[PDB]
Design a protein around this ligand. Structure first.
Ligand SMILES: Cc1cc2nc3c(=O)[nH]c(=O)nc-3n(C[C@H](O)[C@H](O)[C@H](O)COP(=O)(O)OP(=O)(O)OC[C@H]3O[C@@H](n4cnc5c(N)ncnc54)[C@H](O)[C@@H]3O)c2cc1C
Ligand SMILES: NC(=O)c1ccc[n+]([C@@H]2O[C@H](COP(=O)([O-])OP(=O)(O)OC[C@H]3O[C@@H](n4cnc5c(N)ncnc54)[C@H](OP(=O)(O)O)[C@@H]3O)[C@@H](O)[C@H]2O)c1
Ligand SMILES: O=C1c2ccccc2-c2cc(N3CCC4(CC3)OCCO4)nc3cccc1c23
Length: 256
């Protein structure tokens, strides 16, 4: 469903990322991993772009999008949002900050939502590809504070790759909250720069040794099935696909 709504707040995070907060319509229900298409008439009256909903649907009045400035439309959105914020804060208030009007269409599903019904999962993501796993990790927390054993997911192995140390800041609060509340060791968090994070989990360096990682995760969960969920570059997808076949892991072709 297509509805007018508003960017009611934004943050400016490292590597040119917008942390948009968007007013959630009453009708709009989503599941973690879902994306939507957004139109910003101030940027283009006719163009729709897709973004992962980086918030969990248990958060009640806003959706969140983490949009990285990589080209024309995302660059213009970044520059509109920067300038509007630079201005209203040079020119105090009198009002609240006005919403940027936008239309949203969705939500749209992804097979990543099947994590909640998996026994053992590997999440692998690179850069802003983290966004659906940000939604999903937050959901996994809310759901364990609600129905403690009602979920069949027993172990989440998380691997987040970045070229730039500063990119870890997008979700370091969330990764910290996971390291606080994870007494029962549901999660194995793994950050690779390709610590200074400030987590108990030490930031590793270089391209991960995926052959050794798969060998280990297979050994831990045999003779059970492991599901690999991947959001990132296609060169990495080809390698993860060969490795999923070698060790009998679930894979969805999402990379062309
Ligand atoms: C399901 C889904 C979820 C997504 N979730 C997110 C998300 O959460 N956050 C996020 O930031 N992004 C996300 N994206 C990506 C996104 O939707 C942007 O449209 C793209 O990220 C922004 O388009 P743009 O106009 O700003 O860039 P473009 O101007 O289209 O440029 C995009 C890239 O293509 C290159 N390019 C452009 N033209 C050419 C050319 N002629 N030759 C060669 N290379 C060219 C550019 O150099 C750049 O690397 C998602 C995409 C999908 C499908
Ligand atoms: N899953 C999908 O549907 C899909 C489809 C296409 C792309 N994407 C998007 O692509 C983004 C990243 O791709 P990009 O074009 O921006 O490339 P990129 O900048 O090269 O990717 C950024 C990160 O990926 C690592 N990486 C790249 N190729 C790798 C490989 N073969 N093996 C291991 N690590 C590798 C980089 O490490 P190095 O510094 O060593 O390069 C870096 O940490 C993600 O944010 C994702 O959202 C998603
Ligand atoms: O930055 C990207 C991105 C950049 C260029 C190309 C694709 C993406 C991207 C794609 C993506 N897909 C694309 C393929 C999909 C939905 C999941 O639709 C058909 C199979 O599954 N899911 C994504 C989630 C977060 C970020 C991104 C993405």
């Amino acid at each position: 469903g297509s509805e007018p709504t508003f960017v009611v707040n934004a943050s400016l995070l490292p590597s040119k990322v917008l942390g948009l907060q968007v007013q959630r319509p009453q009708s709009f229900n989503y599941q973690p991993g879902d994306y939507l298409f957004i139109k910003c008439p101030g940027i283009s009256k006719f163009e729709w772009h897709p973004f992962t909903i980086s918030s969990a649907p248990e958060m009640p009045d806003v959706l969140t999008l983490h949009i990285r400035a990589v080209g024309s439309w995302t660059g213009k959105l970044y520059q509109l949002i920067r300038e509007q914020r630079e201005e209203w804060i040079r020119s105090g208030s009198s009002q609240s900050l006005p919403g940027v009007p936008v239309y949203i269409d969705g939500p749209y599903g992804t097979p990543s939502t099947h994590i909640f019904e998996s026994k053992y999962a590997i999440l692998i993501c690179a850069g802003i590809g983290v966004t659906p796993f940000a939604s999903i990790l937050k959901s996994i927390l809310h759901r364990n504070q609600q129905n403690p054993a009602k979920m069949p997911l027993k172990k989440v192995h998380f691997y987040w790759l970045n070229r730039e140390q500063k990119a870890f800041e997008w979700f370091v609060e969330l990764l910290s909250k996971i390291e606080a509340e994870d007494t029962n060791n549901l999660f194995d968090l793994n950050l690779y720069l390709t610590l200074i994070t400030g987590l108990k989990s030490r930031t590793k360096t270089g391209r991960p040794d995926w052959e050794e990682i798969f060998k280990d995760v297979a050994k831990q969960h045999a003779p059970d099935n492991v599901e690999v969920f991947f959001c990132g570059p296609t060169g990495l997808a080809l390698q993860l696909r060969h490795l999923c076949t070698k060790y009998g892991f679930g894979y969805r072709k999402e990379n062309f």
